[PDB]
Design a protein around this ligand. Structure first.
Ligand SMILES: O=C(NCCc1ccc2c(c1)[C@H]1C[C@@H](N2)[C@H](O)CO1)C(=O)NC1CCCC1
Length: 164
C-alpha cells in the first residue's frame, strides 16, 4: 500500500498541530520513497528541525530545505537531485503535495502543499501525494505567510515520521 506520513509543525515555538500525508507510491514510487525516508530520518538526514521557508497565502506552503534553510538547498536520499518520475498526478486543488524544483530533473527534498488548485504547475512539478488530515494546520501555516513568501513567524517541522 501507500505510506501515511506526518509532519508536526510549530510557529515561534508553539504547536500548530499535525499534517498527515498519503504518499502515492502506487504512481510515483521513487518520489514517494524519498519523501517517506526524509520524514523518518532513516538515512541520517531529513525534515526534522527544518522550516516552511516560503509561504504564499492563496497559493502554497513550501518547505524541505534542511541543508540551507533558505530555498536554495535540500537533497534527496538518492543524491543531490533525481529525475522527474512522471507527471501522472495533477495539481487538482488544495491539499496536493508536490515537488519543488529548479527545472527539469532537479527534485531534491523541497516540496510544497497547495492551498488552491495550481494546474499551471501540471507537467512541470511532480505531484506525489495529498493531505489526508490536518488541512486546518496547513491553513494555520498559510496564515503566517505573505504575498512575498516571507513568513511572519518561524514555522518549524519539529517532528515527522511514518504512521503506516
Ligand atoms: O522554489 C522552487 N524551486 C526553486 C528552489 C529549489 C527546489 C528544489 C531543489 C533546489 C532548489 C536545489 C537543490 C535540489 N532541489 C536540486 O539539486 C536543484 O537545486 C519551487 O519549485 N517552488 C514551487 C512552489 C510552488 C511553485 C513551484
Amino acid at each position: 500500500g501507500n505510506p501515511l506520513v506526518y509532519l508536526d509543525v510549530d510557529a515561534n515555538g508553539k504547536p500548530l498541530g499535525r499534517v498527515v500525508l498519503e504518499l502515492k507510491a502506487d504512481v510515483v514510487p521513487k518520489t514517494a520513497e524519498n519523501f517517506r525516508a526524509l520524514c523518518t530520518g532513516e538515512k541520517g538526514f531529513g525534515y526534522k528541525g527544518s522550516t516552511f521557508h516560503r509561504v504564499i497565502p492563496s497559493f502554497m506552503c513550501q518547505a524541505g530545505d534542511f541543508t540551507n534553510h533558505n530555498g536554495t538547498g535540500g537533497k534527496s536520499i538518492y543524491g543531490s537531485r533525481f529525475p522527474d518520475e512522471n507527471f501522472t498526478l495533477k495539481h487538482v486543488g488544495p491539499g496536493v503535495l508536490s515537488m519543488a524544483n529548479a527545472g527539469p530533473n532537479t527534485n531534491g527534498s523541497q516540496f510544497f502543499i497547495c492551498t488552491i488548485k495550481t494546474d499551471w504547475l501540471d507537467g512541470k512539478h511532480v505531484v506525489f501525494g495529498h493531505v489526508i488530515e490536518g488541512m486546518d494546520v496547513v491553513k494555520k501555516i498559510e496564515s503566517f505567510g505573505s504575498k512575498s513568501g516571507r513568513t511572519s513567524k518561524k514555522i518549524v517541522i519539529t517532528d515527522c515520521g511514518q504512521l503506516s
